[PDB]
Design a protein around this ligand. Structure first.
Ligand SMILES: Nc1ncnc2c1ncn2[C@@H]1O[C@H](COP(=O)(O)OP(=O)(O)O)[C@@H](O)[C@H]1O
Ligand SMILES: [Mg+2]
Lengths: 317, 41, 470, 578, 193, 159, 193
């Protein structure tokens, strides 16, 4: 296309920097912020006006200045390049591959916010996916196309339950009207803020029994910046909705620690100067958790499902 | 013992809530003090 | 003196001054009214447009037409000397005893330069206070800071004045250390009333403990910024004496709660957002600034021991003032309201008190070989005498064992011969004599935490023969 | 570089005009004396400098010059036997200059520019150096300090100075694009030093004491947390696991604490003994020292300086134990930092990013293959100490979320004279399931089974502790009294350990396995002796229990001459009975 | 508008046993259902929508999940109201504003629902309006109030929250309409503290 | 509300036990109501017309859907009429001030629209002065036959 | 101004048994009686105004009821002062800034009483000063500091409040006056938390 680098920063305080006469940027656009060395950062345009637009910088603003800093414009809606060969690979919190392999040749670039489903197009979740856990089979029951959290604690094994029902859960059509060749199954697994110990644990549990040939991994370490922890469930659910509503999979999504997502949201939300809610968590946190929980479910006409298991530790029980 | 501990934790959380509201109001009034000079110009 | 007329905005305590770029930050000014009255102020927020001045006193006769500010002493200093060991001062350093002003040998800045942690020794030798339940069970050592956690109604000024007129280093307990080290007391009383100010000047002119002590006394109707500056003056006189003349200095800081309230009101006057429970965010560093100006130094002979005294606001150790103070200092000694109402002076229960740096400053060559074991045995014996006293309310006196009645009588004799001292002055030998007379009530073999040599030397002594407490 | 002037002085915040082009979070010198401060909040032509020291005395119009580079550390030779502080200013040379105080504006360099080192290159002109590649050696203290190219520099080398006695300012190699390379380099203390592959924890950090490597391992490249209450034996445990460690570089970080609580570190630590050569331990230890009255920014940056120095030593291919004492002190220094920046607080008074900063501290610690091609580790045993003594502050909760082991010292056990005072009912370690094949190979193939057996016995003793507390051990049945006595011999022999002893100070895996099997064999043979019907009284008074008592006071030279004979005596004295 | 507001003297037969015997709401009454999650609060609202004596049901759901909306859309046309026969869906007007849908529109959802209930009240019917998660409407008012830079009061909510909430619950009543005929509208508001 | 209506329908002075003779002077009633919904209003007007008191009472009504700022003027103009009828025509006015918590939240609204620093829980610092200027306009004066007695009603929030 | 301030060694006899036996007040001492509403503050202070051994009594109603100043106006001339025979109203000055009076005068009301008590101290008397509701003076300062658009300390009060309280309570205390003879002001202050 053509590159249009805005210069003329007027104010840089926290994650916020004010670009002036940037009228041609839209609200919510994604920008990259080139430093005076050559190191490009990212950011999102909030609060556009006629005299300044407020870039929120994703990473830390260390090294920026007012003379040499440029703000370009990269893909106004935050899209993701998704193809079907992702099954069996590992990705960053953003979506860049980290397994020693070349990237994804994309089939379709679809946004990561995701449009709300229409309640006349959604149908009822009416079938049965079987995990290996006897309680979650017999007494509770994971219906194909719902979401249910696993409330855990600190010294409670929740990563092991995650890695267990990620590798031994299946749908069994032979108890239903069969079509056993017709329906395949897949797992999307998004870990949000994990120790390297937990990273190697999930990679060994997914390469130990051949469980990785079904699944896609969106692992996120705690070394990584906080915006990757915000963007991880939206990348995982974008890939889940693609695979479920384009090829009729039966995607099971595991969001293994939502408490770190909420703490990252509280961290990046104390930059808009808005009054927090209950104990520092923002007032919009119902809407932000709802925009990544409501994306599960089944749609009429299709045959695919998105079934979410958010695992989250109560900080005190 | 845990009933009294639950009451103590509830009261401590709501006192922290009121303190956080007060330090929001002080930041708002400091911005409104600063706006007087920028309107004085 | 190049006075700056032409000011704007007198409001509250603050006043703005136009065209004042030569006022340094933190400087002091004289503010002359049109009548001729001179106030004092301190410069904050110096800029090209205007410099803010926080006035010490009230702003009553001030106006925008006849008012001039003049610079005095562009950073706050005091003139320090050796000839101020019998003097009273008020917060800034003006003599209030009527005696002539001192001739300053040096002119030192009052804010602290921090000690270099390479150049500090381990605080290893002790200081007696005369109070037995401070000297024996949780010893103060030379180089230690430790507060008294007083209460609301509790008598903290009395124990302050008693430790001031009663503290003494005893170099006889080493291998003949010389008395060429002298001892001196610096006493900073902040937030005090007229009544207790009269009490301290009476108490220091009565017994003649004013010749080795220098007092920095400010009232409650004095400006609060003088309550900020008072422990700075006290600690710089202390550091001057102990590191320039090798004195052993004891700094008693009365009512550190009043200092923290003065700091909160000056922060809110200088228009900044507070932190936790309304107290300012910089409180830990600004409080360690005057707690961490105490301790021995390698190559120097002098030392600065420090006793801050502070009242818990509603008798809880989760308030920020005692929480951060106990998070800086070395233990505490805690006054109990229960022993005071029972009627006991000094009302110190030793069960929640602690000297974290006790065990270094006792032993052979320091006091005596049995000091730590006597302290541990008295602590365990009183700690399991109190709950037996609580137990006998529902069981009965005859339905206990022998040892339980022995611990009950031990607790009863302990808290009215060992703690209930009155104003008798006890050295460490009379205090350990009373301690072994109290341990002689319990039988041998129940004294588990004492070596058998010390038991063979000291067990067996009457209380009605020693007359340390008859 | 970029030189402005002061226009406003409010507290420690100096608003300086003129500096257009200055960088954010960039160190700068404010005033005619030189006051170090970091630049926040660029606004138009100005810059708000947060100054570290007190500004009382500064006038308006004084120069503010800019450094150009963020808060960095000078990594190179000359750091061992070194007592630094939070922004790496060597405290001993400040003592040499300005007496017993630290006057504001003491400018000393982080490394000794006057000490002559012995260069020996391992490159030659015509070689192609990429970052991390070792290009020479310097002997420091019997310690081959391998000089690295800084990790973002590459090119073709020339002009290699020959093997001689140089100084740390002289450039030793020169690339063919300008770009001389000295013996040192400045690295920013907040970005992590780049590596090529983090490995996984499957190799244990051998602590030295036979509870924290048998019952609660930590797995080198790992992360532990210890709470410090008073009277627990904290300092002797830290000194013992820095003296008898698996690591070979120790970095201690005292991140702002009491003056008397670390002036007895600074006098007790340089008289220890390295028990591999005979010299003192300070010849392989770097020590960052802050008291609680230093500036807030140094007292907040001390742990990042510690981690960056420890990553410099892992990049050479070494094993570094970083012990960052009192992380709660650091966390309230960070809370004070955030209070002057006017931020909305979090759960208690803390910033919203406390756990993000703690994750950036603890997760920079792993077993790794460096850019040169050899392994190294930064195992962190960093401590914690809440002021209340309860474990439900935000700091301790975030630490327990992001560490891999927790070793609960309790002051009751040191009151009971059980040293070390590790409570096993409240400690945990997650590295047990991952350290399995190292135990299976290098110790014995059955080692986790009797590890779980001793954990099972210590479970059951405290499980039936209530009956013992209600009655007393002489009225328990038969087998329950056997359980309490074998749990007692586990406590009074295996778990307890004298750190000031000659040969009980260290206990390897073979010696711990020997005592472990000895205790468990005595238990599950005396259990069969009770199944015969033998009374409990003859089991307890028995002369072979003296051998299990002095099982630990035996040198490991002579433990494969002691273990076999004691294991024969147990079978003999339990087949001789009826 | 109306001609005259009457007094309620005829119960709203909810079809349950604890919500009509022990704690009854009358025909022009107002009721509020609090309760945390997993405590019913959705099956009770749907039971009110299924088994009632009301002529028409306006089911306005603001801020809650969409599986309930598709559940009502799926399982109502198979059922039968026990008043006139025919399908149960032929008397329900349902207004959905799911939580993933925009957040400033759930303010308008409540007013649209109560205006439709007043329209069927002005013809002679007996409307039942189930207003689901009015606390999410309070959160929407909190959102626009904090976006408008207003002073909060008691956890972020605007000070006019009680006034807006009273002006919503005041529209329920047993009236005689302007056509002479009488009608009523009752309101059951599920609140989620 | 039932207790206030019962007091309003059976409050009588006892002239024979007091010793001031006998006249049996009944009560004029001033009824100020701020956010009564419809059920409370229906109960009060049916109670008053059943006991025969609307020929002696004057009502300043403010329903729940009426605008929430005229609640500031409602009690002041009720007590203006009460002070008039008691101190210039010598009645014995009893003033029922319904639901003062709605008045206090109305002044919280108008005091948070003006960015004013609050007291406790968001209510402004001058709420003591407003409640004082409403309440303290009652009592008896010297040498005059009148009286203003006040019964307010408060809904304590978390009781 | 004054010549010297003595130390106090003579009790202020209240007459109440607990406040004179267990918790006494010297003649040159201050005292503070806080408590919730309905606890006994104003009845206690009228008891001190009615029975104590002060030569003169200054009663400062600082932002309180008018009925409890009407009580003191009406039923004090019916009583008899101890230590003399004249009525009790002949020894009391009564400053009365009530609740519905203007709020900015409460600071002036709390200072007029203390300077009248200092004037009668300078004649050789022994003055009692019963000032109720110093917290209403604090609230008046808060309401006027809202108009000054300042930044407050904790709870909303302006930060010079404890300096004002120290300067108020320090103006007591058993002096020897400029005329050589001795006198005292003793200040009993009610606080309403
Ligand atoms: N000391 C007392 N003796 C007798 N009755 C008392 C006493 N104190 C309080 N009361 C009763 O309780 C009421 C308390 O009124 P008051 O103390 O003025 O409340 P507050 O102190 O909250 O203003 C008095 O009217 C009286 O009826
Ligand atoms: Mg009163």
């Amino acid at each position: 296309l053509l590159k249009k680098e805005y210069t003329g920063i007027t104010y840089i305080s926290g994650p916020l920097l004010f670009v002036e006469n940037a009228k041609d940027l839209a609200y919510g656009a994604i920008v990259d912020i080139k430093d005076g060395t050559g190191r490009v950062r990212g950011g999102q345009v909030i609060e556009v006006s006629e005299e300044y637009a407020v870039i929120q910088v994703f990473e830390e603003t260390t090294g920026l200045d007012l003379a040499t800093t440029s703000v370009s414009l990269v893909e106004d809606v935050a899209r993701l390049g998704v193809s079907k060969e992702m099954l069996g690979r590992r990705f960053n919190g953003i979506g860049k591959p980290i397994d020693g392999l070349p990237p994804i040749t994309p089939e379709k670039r679809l946004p990561i916010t995701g449009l709300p489903l229409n309640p006349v197009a959604r149908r009822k979740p009416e079938q049965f996916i079987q995990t290996g856990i006897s309680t979650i089979d017999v007494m509770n029951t994971l219906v194909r196309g719902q979401k249910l959290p696993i409330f855990s604690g600190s010294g409670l094994p929740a990563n092991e339950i995650a890695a267990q029902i990620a590798r031994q859960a299946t749908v069994r059509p032979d108890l239903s009207g069969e079509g056993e060749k017709e329906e395949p199954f897949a797992v999307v697994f998004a870990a949000m803020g994990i120790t390297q110990r937990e990273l190697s644990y999930f990679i060994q549990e997914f390469e130990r029994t051949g469980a990785l040939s079904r699944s896609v991994l969106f692992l996120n370490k705690a070394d990584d910046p906080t915006i990757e922890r915000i963007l991880t469930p939206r990348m995982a659910l974008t890939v889940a909705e693609y695979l479920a509503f384009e090829h009729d999979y039966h995607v099971l999504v595991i969001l293994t620690d939502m408490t770190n997502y909420c703490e990252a949201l509280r961290e990046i939300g104390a930059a808009r100067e808005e009054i927090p809610g209950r104990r520092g968590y923002p007032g919009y946190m119902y809407t932000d958790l709802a925009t990544i929980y409501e994306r599960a479910g089944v749609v009429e006409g299709k045959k695919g499902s998105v079934t979410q298991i958010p695992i989250l530790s109560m900080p005190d029980d | 013992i845990p009933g009294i501990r639950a009451q103590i934790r509830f009261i401590q959380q709501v006192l922290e809530q009121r303190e956080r509201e007060d330090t929001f109001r002080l930041k708002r009034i400091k911005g409104k003090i600063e706006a007087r000079e920028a309107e004085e110009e | 003196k190049k006075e700056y007329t032409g000011i704007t905005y007198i409001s509250g305590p603050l006043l703005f001054v136009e065209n004042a770029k030569d006022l340094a930050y933190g400087a002091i000014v004289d503010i002359k009214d049109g009548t001729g009255r001179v106030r004092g102020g301190q410069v904050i927020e110096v800029s090209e447009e205007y410099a803010v001045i926080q006035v010490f006193e009230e702003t009553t006769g001030l106006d925008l037409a006849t008012t001039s500010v003049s610079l005095v002493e562009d950073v706050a200093r005091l003139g320090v000397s050796k000839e101020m060991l019998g003097r009273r001062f008020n917060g800034i350093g003006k003599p209030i005893d009527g005696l002539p002003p001192i001739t300053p040998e040096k002119r030192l800045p009052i804010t602290g330069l921090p000690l270099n942690p390479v150049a500090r020794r381990k605080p290893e030798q002790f200081i007696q206070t005369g109070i037995s339940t401070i000297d024996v069970m949780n010893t103060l050592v030379r180089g230690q800071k430790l507060p008294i956690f007083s209460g609301s109604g509790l008598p903290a000024n009395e124990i302050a004045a008693q430790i001031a007129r009663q503290a003494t280093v005893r170099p006889d307990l080493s291998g003949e250390g010389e008395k060429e080290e002298p001892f001196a007391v610096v006493f900073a009383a902040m937030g005090i009333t007229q009544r207790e100010l009269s009490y301290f000047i009476q108490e220091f002119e009565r017994t003649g403990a004013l010749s080795r002590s220098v007092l920095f006394l400010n009232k409650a109707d004095d400006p609060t910024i003088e309550r900020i500056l008072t422990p700075r003056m006290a600690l710089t006189v202390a550091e001057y004496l102990a590191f320039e003349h090798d004195y052993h200095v004891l700094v008693i800081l009365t009512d550190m709660t009043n200092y923290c309230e003065a700091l909160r009101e000056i922060g809110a006057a200088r228009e900044e957002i507070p932190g936790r429970r309304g107290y300012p965010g910089y409180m830990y560093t600004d409080l360690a600034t005057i707690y961490e100006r105490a301790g021995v130094v390698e190559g120097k002979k002098g030392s600065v021991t420090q006793i801050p005294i502070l009242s818990m606001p509603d008798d809880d150790r989760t308030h920020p003032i005692p929480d951060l103070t106990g998070y800086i200092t070395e233990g505490q000694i805690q006054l109990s309201r229960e022993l005071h109402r029972k009627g006991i002076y000094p009302p110190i229960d030793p069960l929640p008190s602690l000297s974290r740096l006790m065990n270094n400053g006792v032993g052979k060559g320091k006091t005596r070989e049995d000091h730590k074991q006597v302290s541990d045995q008295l602590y365990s014996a009183y700690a399991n005498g109190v709950d037996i006293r609580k137990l006998v309310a529902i069981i009965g006196e005859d339905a206990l064992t022998e040892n339980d009645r022995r611990y009950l009588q031990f607790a009863d004799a302990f808290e009215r011969f060992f703690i209930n001292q009155g104003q008798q002055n006890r050295s460490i030998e009379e205090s350990l004599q009373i301690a072994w007379a109290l341990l002689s009530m319990l039988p041998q073999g129940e004294l588990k935490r004492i070596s058998k040599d010390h038991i063979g030397k000291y067990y067996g002594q009457k209380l009605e023969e020693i007359w340390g407490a008859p | 570089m970029i030189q402005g002037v002061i226009q406003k002085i409010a507290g420690p915040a100096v608003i300086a005009k003129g500096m257009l082009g200055a960088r954010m979070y960039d160190i700068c010198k404010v005033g005619e004396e030189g006051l170090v401060g970091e630049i926040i909040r660029l606004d138009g032509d100005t810059a708000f400098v947060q100054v570290y020291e007190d500004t009382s005395g500064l006038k308006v119009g004084e120069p503010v010059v800019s450094t150009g580079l963020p808060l960095a550390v000078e990594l190179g030779p000359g750091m061992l036997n070194g007592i630094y502080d939070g922004i790496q200013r060597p405290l001993e040379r400040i003592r040499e200059k300005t007496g017993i105080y630290i006057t504001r504006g003491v400018v000393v360099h982080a490394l000794d520019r006057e000490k002559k080192w012995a260069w020996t290159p391992m490159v030659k002109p015509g070689d192609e150096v990429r970052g991390g590649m070792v290009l020479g050696t310097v002997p420091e203290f019997g310690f081959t300090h391998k000089i690295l190219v800084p990790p973002d520099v590459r090119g073709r080398v020339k002009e290699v100075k020959p093997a001689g006695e140089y100084t740390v300012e002289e450039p030793v190699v020169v690339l063919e694009d300008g770009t001389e390379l000295k013996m040192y380099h400045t690295w920013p203390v907040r970005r992590a030093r780049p590596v090529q592959r983090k490995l996984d924890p499957n190799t244990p950090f051998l602590t030295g004491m036979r509870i924290l490597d048998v019952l609660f391992p930590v797995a080198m490249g790992g992360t532990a947390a210890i709470p410090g209450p008073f009277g627990s034996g904290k300092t002797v445990t830290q000194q013992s696991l820095a003296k008898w460690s698996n690591a070979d570089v120790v970095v201690y970080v005292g991140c702002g604490e009491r003056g008397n609580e670390m002036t007895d570190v600074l006098v007790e630590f340089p008289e220890l003994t390295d028990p591999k050569t005979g010299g003192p331990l300070m010849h392989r230890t770097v020590l960052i020292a802050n008291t609680s009255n230093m500036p807030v920014a140094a007292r907040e940056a001390s742990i990042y300086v510690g981690v960056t120095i420890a990553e410099y030593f892992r990049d050479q291919g070494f094993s570094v134990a970083l012990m960052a004492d009192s992380t709660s002190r650091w966390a309230e220094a960070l809370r004070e930092i955030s209070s002057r920046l006017e931020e909305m607080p979090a759960e208690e008074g803390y910033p919203p990013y406390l756990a993000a900063r703690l994750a950036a501290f603890y997760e920079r610690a792993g077993k790794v293959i460096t850019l040169g091609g050899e392994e190294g580790a930064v195992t962190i045993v960093g401590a914690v100490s809440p002021p209340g003594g309860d474990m439900s502050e935000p700091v301790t909760q975030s630490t327990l979320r992001i560490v891999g082991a927790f070793w609960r010292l309790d002051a009751s056990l040191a009151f009971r004279r059980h040293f070390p005072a590790i409570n096993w009912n409240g400690s945990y370690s997650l590295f047990t399931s991952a350290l399995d094949p190292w135990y299976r190979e290098n110790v014995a193939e059955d080692y986790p089974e009797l590890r779980d057996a001793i954990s099972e016995l210590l479970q059951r003793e405290a499980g039936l502790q209530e009956i013992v507390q209600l009655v007393g051990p002489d009225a328990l049945q038969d087998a329950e009294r056997l359980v309490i006595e074998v749990g007692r011999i586990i406590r009074e022999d295996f778990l307890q350990q004298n750190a000031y002893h000659e040969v009980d100070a260290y206990c390897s895996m073979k010696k711990a396995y020997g005592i472990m099997k000895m205790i468990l064999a005595f238990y599950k043979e005396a259990e069969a002796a009770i199944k015969r019907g033998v009374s409990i009284d003859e089991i307890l008074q028995l002369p072979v229990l003296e051998r299990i008592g002095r099982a630990r006071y035996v040198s490991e030279e002579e433990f494969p001459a002691y273990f076999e004979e004691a294991m024969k005596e147990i079978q003999g004295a339990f087949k001789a009975l009826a």
